[PDB]
Design an enzyme around this catalytic site. Sequence first.
Site: not given
Lengths: 316, 316
Positions: B23, B60, B82, B146, B178, B198, B218, B220-221, B229, B259-261, B315
């Site tokens: 993005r 938070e 935020w 959230y 369950r 996320c 879904r 993650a940085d 997290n 992912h890693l920037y 980012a």
Amino acid sequence: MLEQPYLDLAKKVLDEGHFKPDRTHTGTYSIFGHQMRFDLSKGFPLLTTKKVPFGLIKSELLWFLHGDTNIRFLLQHRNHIWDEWAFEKWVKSDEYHGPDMTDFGHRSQKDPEFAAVYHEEMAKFDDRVLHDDAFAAKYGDLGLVYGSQWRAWHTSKGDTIDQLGDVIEQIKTHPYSRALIVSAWNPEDVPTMALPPCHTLYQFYVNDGKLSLQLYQRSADIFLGVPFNIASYALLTHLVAHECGLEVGEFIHTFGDAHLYVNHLDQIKEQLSRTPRPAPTLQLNPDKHDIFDFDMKDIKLLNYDPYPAIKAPVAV
Amino acid sequence: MLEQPYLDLAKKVLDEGHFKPDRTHTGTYSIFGHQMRFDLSKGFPLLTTKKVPFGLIKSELLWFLHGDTNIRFLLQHRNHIWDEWAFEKWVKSDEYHGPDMTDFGHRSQKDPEFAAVYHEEMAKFDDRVLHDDAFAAKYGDLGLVYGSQWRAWHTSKGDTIDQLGDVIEQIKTHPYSRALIVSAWNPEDVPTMALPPCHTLYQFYVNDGKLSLQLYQRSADIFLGVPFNIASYALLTHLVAHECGLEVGEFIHTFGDAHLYVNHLDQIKEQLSRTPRPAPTLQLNPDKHDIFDFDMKDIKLLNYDPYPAIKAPVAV
């Protein structure tokens, strides 16, 4: 081989599984948190260590893709996977006039002619759903099922959202989206649902021209359900890839509670003594591209040479 | 050590990660499908390889547990996580009267005094949210966050569902369920949301008197987000366990797109040269039990002796 992740799951649940009482009085050995991946470029992950009815997997998935929630379609394909749920509603209806049937599930596995009477009424029910359009509409429509959740999510405006349709749209226009998610979990329906969705949500992912999918399954029956569950989503992955003009990547299966029923121990043990064979290949209709308009004949399974089927009592 | 799963994630993304445009015009190395588990009985999974602000994680989460969606609470705790989202809405409001601020995010990291003007207006905004109750109500309320999704899911009747409250209820009465699931994903809001959740959904699980939780993230940085997290959900696990009179089990972190920037490569590489130290311990107020009424002073972190903090560009 391709299906090893499955066999490894079975092994692990047997060695590390802790006894856990469940919704039924037939114990389970369970584990929490597991993930396995299948490379769809290596072949289709349909178990070779035991014969699995691909036809049933195919019909049920097309039913889902059609946004259908009426059992009639399934009956028209010799597929009885959801009969019980419809029957459940029928028997408890003010129009039902036949033997009791209270808790038919539990009782059928332990009674002689009762199971015969049950089967008799079920046969009538199926025939009725198949021929009386009015009947099928009232008792054949399960309502809240995958087809409805995937393609007709009810909103607050009273309108409906075609999640899957929109996501496929997003895959074509924004393949690099990290939100290609379809959820089957609705908090407002879940509290009062016979069986809240087992296949909670899935996510697509595109990279290097390959499409992959991850499924989060909250509860899974290692022996009876998982082999079908793997096939259903690996197939879905292929279809979506087919429509979006992409190649297949991997199918990632994530589990919450993965469990094996005690009355399946011997059956899983014997399967673990069989040696996997080359995985089958999947062929899709080259001309057809709108997967939503797909029909049975558009999906072909090739070179599926499995071991004989293994019979095991269901948990009810 | 306890945090090895994290370091292994970083290593894996560096070795197997495939370049993927996101993005933002700052590339990423990404992988799809990953799962790691932390045994909470061994200690609290707060990274020791780099100083992480536990105070921010605590505030938070309490904000979340309170079903709060107004930034004012966070500002009252020196927590600015935020701010951007509220500011975003404020600037685009017909009442905003100051320098442009169009796309403040992207522009702040590249401009000199612009970042100073931006910081200036943000400071005003924060002060205003903190003192003008009318202002805080209009621009301090993020709405769909959230806290709202966990404790005030909007239904079709116009009523709201306290998912988390109900699940905790289900854990006490049906620990072997369950379906102890809480979802933050709402298909009807997602199409038009600045940043769809996320942390998509989580599931609790009880076995042998131990409580465990699995989180499906879904996106993650790896570098900036993941360390927080992990702490947030490991803490949640402890609190819920604390209220349900259970011991802690494991925290299972499942990822979609991890992912890693690229502008973090050197920073992650240097962290990987540090040797983990004994994990810290968490202490909760023994007297208090209603986690929803919990306050900052009720959660204590002990023996947290980390390495210095590592700075890295965000980012945007």
